[PDB]
Symmetry: D2
Subunit: 384 residues, 4 copies
């Protein structure tokens, strides 16, 4: 289960670089130089790294300092072969964003948020990023009157439309991915789930430029089925990117290493991604727990990739197993993939076997055989 750059595993600078500050505790780890993280991640078999602007260039940096930070980073990329497939903007850490970036009540903040984003889009394109992620972590509210959500969605649409106009005007070959999260750090975050983000995208001026960057743990913070949400994103043609991690149910955003948290959901996710031929980066947005020293950081990052590869093997073995293929037919997964009424509406209406002569009791008595199928899945997951 050794990862290669072929597997397209990517990590955010902020992931292995998380110093371990949480709402109740100081940092337990010193800051990592991005150059060192690139080197270490390349040694582990990562394909690339991702960054917020403020991960790479400290907020408030001069243009010459910005120059220097990028050149050092680019040299590390050249030295390692690491790619930068995705970049994003930090519109959540600085106090100015305390009420949001794109949907801050203050108009001048929203304008600043856009300008900060645009500057990093240019850098992202320069570094070869194909996807630009937007996580509006501060877009939302703790109280009902603070945020008229219709106005805020107007502002959110306006911001994304202007970004789309910007990338079009520049001829950039980059697409946007909206990363939903239901809550934290705001009491409720706008576009809280994959579904809300998908629906929002359809109201943008150029919907083709926008997809979703769902995160395992974020959908699970709403108790939702992450593979189901990913399937809907795939069905819509909008799975531009994905954030992999672990989460133990409905609580604060844990960002455990991938495979931790809901392991069976991870299995079904990998099954779906591989079956659907998802070709984008397998990006880990995780935090090595603050209990860990730097050896634990790299162990946790390695485990992200290891668990993906183990689940990939098990999911492939599951789907390739002739006994499973028979069980899938026994459960009529093949019939699910057949049109209900390719014969059309009138033929359906005239079809007495569909209603007047339909034996509802004989159909009702047919067991779905889902439990045998699921135990085969369990056996495959466990290597049993």
């Amino acid at each position: 289960y050794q990862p290669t750059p072929e597997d397209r595993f990517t990590f955010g600078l902020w992931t292995v670089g998380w110093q371990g500050r949480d709402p109740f505790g100081d940092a337990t780890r010193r800051a990592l130089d991005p150059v060192e993280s690139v080197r270490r991640l390349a040694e582990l078999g990562a394909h690339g790294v991702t960054f917020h602007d403020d991960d790479l260039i400290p907020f408030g940096s001069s243009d010459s300092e910005r120059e220097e930070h990028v050149k050092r980073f680019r040299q590390a990329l050249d030295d390692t072969g690491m790619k930068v497939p995705m970049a994003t903007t930090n519109l959540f850490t600085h106090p100015v964003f305390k009420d949001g970036g794109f949907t801050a009540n203050d108009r001048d903040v929203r304008r600043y948020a856009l300008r900060k984003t645009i500057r990093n889009i240019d850098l992202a394109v320069e570094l070869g990023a194909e996807t630009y992620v937007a996580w509006g972590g501060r877009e939302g509210a703790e109280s009902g009157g603070a945020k008229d959500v219709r106005d805020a969605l107007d502002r959110m649409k306006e911001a994304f439309d202007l970004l789309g106009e910007y990338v079009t005007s520049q001829g950039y070959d980059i697409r946007f991915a909206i990363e939903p999260k239901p809550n934290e750090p705001r009491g409720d975050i706008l576009l809280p789930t994959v579904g809300h983000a998908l629906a929002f995208i359809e109201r943008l001026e150029r919907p083709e430029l926008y997809g979703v960057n769902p995160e395992v743990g974020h959908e699970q913070m709403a108790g939702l089925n992450f593979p189901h949400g990913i399937a809907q994103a795939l069905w819509a043609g909008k799975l531009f990117h994905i954030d992999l991690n672990g989460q133990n149910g409905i609580k604060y955003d844990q960002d455990l290493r991938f495979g931790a948290g809901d392991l069976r959901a991870a299995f079904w996710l990998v099954d779906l991604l591989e079956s659907a031929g998802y070709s984008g980066p397998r990006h880990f947005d995780f935090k090595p727990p603050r209990t860990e020293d730097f050896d634990g950081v790299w162990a946790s990052a390695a485990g992200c990739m290891r668990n993906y590869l183990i689940l990939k093997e098990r999911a492939a073995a599951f789907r390739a197993d002739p006994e499973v293929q028979e069980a899938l037919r026994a459960s009529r997964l093949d019939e699910l993939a057949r049109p209900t009424a390719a014969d059309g509406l009138q033929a359906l209406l005239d079809d007495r076997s569909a209603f007047e002569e339909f034996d509802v009791d004989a159909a009702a008595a047919r067991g779905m055989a889902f439990e045998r199928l699921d135990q085969l899945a369990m056996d495959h997951l466990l290597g049993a």
Copy 2:
């Protein structure tokens, strides 16, 4: 706080008619004749009733029995002035639907589900219903392999597209409303939230025919902010109908009377519905707790309407209060409603006050004054 038919309060037959059977207990109340529920609800000030096909016509009824059940119902409507603004299909109670209706793995069940739906659409139109609700309570899964969600969404789209073709072909002036629910009775239900349903609608052949019928408790079963979800539905122009009830957080679907559960969310919901001028029925999908006898049933139904009317008064007083209007300006809700960059992208890019000369620290120091605003909201809610 006396409701009138003007207030458009509607109730499902299955609500006050719930006999109190839950997963662990037998019925505590005898069945209600729909005619009696119409009469009793009219006496309480309801505007109308809604029904599943199987609420009104017992499953398996002959055409003559169906005739008789409808005529008796129509006479009660004529006797009371009650309307039927919405109807829906029971595709969840009968064992034949144990794996779904529209997305059952068995093709013959999916065809039956459509035929059962179409027959009730005709009846709905005959009775004057403007909205036809679809709650796919059995569409989903308990295990990952039982349901290929992409195929299931194909089947769901196919079903809704055929229904849209049917109503168009018939010239019916009826629209569809998809009612999301995250789980229960399936382990996960497809289209689990308002967002997922809104996104799905955009992939239908005639999206204009479809909106959402969100339910308070259902979004709260995912820990989501129901007023936020309603605002997004309104923003999309898709709030065709709404189900009002109460829910105490993330657990089984309680269907408490409206105002029970999350009371402040109910306040903000009423505020939003009234502010946005939502003109559809205020429909209660609730269950009088099985502790109650029939007097408790009507008390609970009356309380649904009473609580809406109290919250409506309090929300109106909140918005009309000049001190609140000043607080809203203090929190810059007015600025939220102003375009971020009506001057356009180039003007934004050339605007040094938006970035180079933006004083981020002075902007960051501005308090949002949300807590004063929210306490005014609290004072208004409590009549303090």
Copy 3:
């Protein structure tokens, strides 16, 4: 992974016998004769069965009918070698219990509840049960004023104290196990978690007669860590019985087969039970999903046992692995088991190395190496 009666796997009659009625659907399976379930479970390798009174003897049965039902059951036990290690009372299905049994507001219902319980205690003892489970599924409330919880706890204590007096007065060698559940079918259930039940037991007149019967899914309905709760029950010496099943997070009580739901929690549970030498029955309180026919029922029941046995193997391999034993030392699990201050309070107070001369920064820099340990656990779970 073939179960034997040695493994002490037990099943409730109501589990494989669940007809599949849920809040939104009719039964999908015919009733099972308890005699057939005993036979079928014995064939699968079960050790025994458990029952509510009303599972075995239909409510309202005459004494001669009761006689006949028990004799038939006893013959099936004799025919199969199956034991009955646990019995319990149905104080939740009949409408009379709609507000509880032991804590119903109506005094006459509480007296009936006790008499119904006592009659089944006699039968339980006759059939050889060692543990008598109490699941107060109806003890609770949907609204705040319906139930004064202090009075209800008084009534609950009174009921359990009288049951303890009864078994003592009769010389019965049976102990009681309180089964907590946070909610469903009541909006909130009294004694909602293992902790609340453990705390309550300490206020009973004869605490030694009472322990807990925690259920995997029930603690997970509160988002709690089930192995942690079991560890506290073991630490208290109160793990008299355990209900094994699966649950996908905070939602309605799914009662999935064991190993489904949170698989890693199942691993850590089995690890703990086996490490602690828990010698009681491994009881499955699960429901074969109503999608299933009877073949699916027995497949699901078999999978309960299979998954326990697989996890048992993996947990044993984990603990036996010298690399894991080294990792446990690296994470200082050995130091956790050493007393903090066996030298006593005064020695601690005089120990300058414990404070004045304690190098907090050197201690803080020590990584816990938990992530390497957890990935070894993952590798062992997955057979990697």
Copy 4:
């Protein structure tokens, strides 16, 4: 609704002093001098303040610096009349506590944790505190193998037993209150609920010295009914202290101002506290949202007290209302308070009206009238 020191409202220094650092953002507010918070809180009508050691004395302070910080604080208390009813230890912020204080795997850390606690107990007693709170926020785990919970409970018991020995040996008139929290900042925290803490206390050497300090939001992070948990704590005689705040369901610990979050739960809490004659401090453990400037901080703190006082008025009006008193009798709350079987076990067994002659159907048909009662409660809450 003006608070007076009579109302015993207390605030932690860390509450109004929270600088607004959250997992995704920097501080939005400058640090508050504790002297200024005491002054400002006294002006608002607070009765007193509480503190962690590290709130009052910066970690690493010299004895002379510690001297100075305490003297300045004591002068502010003398200047304002403010009391310090409760103190606690910060065993969670410093990196040394990353795996816990009392249950850290490292023995030397556990010894340090105790010594740090003992030093602050002395200061607490000097300042007049009656209750010493222990919130073991770092006691727990993110992974199953990191923490043997039985060993950890041994260590937790050992620590609390040594603290009890210490206060006894010193003759201090102070009691301990364990503050449960289910999770955050650890993935799972030991003693996660009021129930677990109550059960744990019963295993301590001197249980009479220990009670619970439940927090509204913490129990609601497990989806539990906070008034129910408080009632059990009162029933056990263990409600030594209480932390009041608001929480919107199962998510990260919001620490909203009291009355925010679940408003009806706040109503029922106040009803219970006032009805039971709880005489301890009404302590607010809340965080003014980081959107706020200092005016918003004091507005939020004032709203804590205001909402308590409004709910107190409404709960008193509810209980004093003769129509409610009649409704309580209609729902048989009076019968709930009567013993089930004061006549004793034998009389119960011989009572044919309790079983053989009990009319279960007539009892079952009696409505509980809970919905009318709850709507009266709603009307009273809303001032309707």
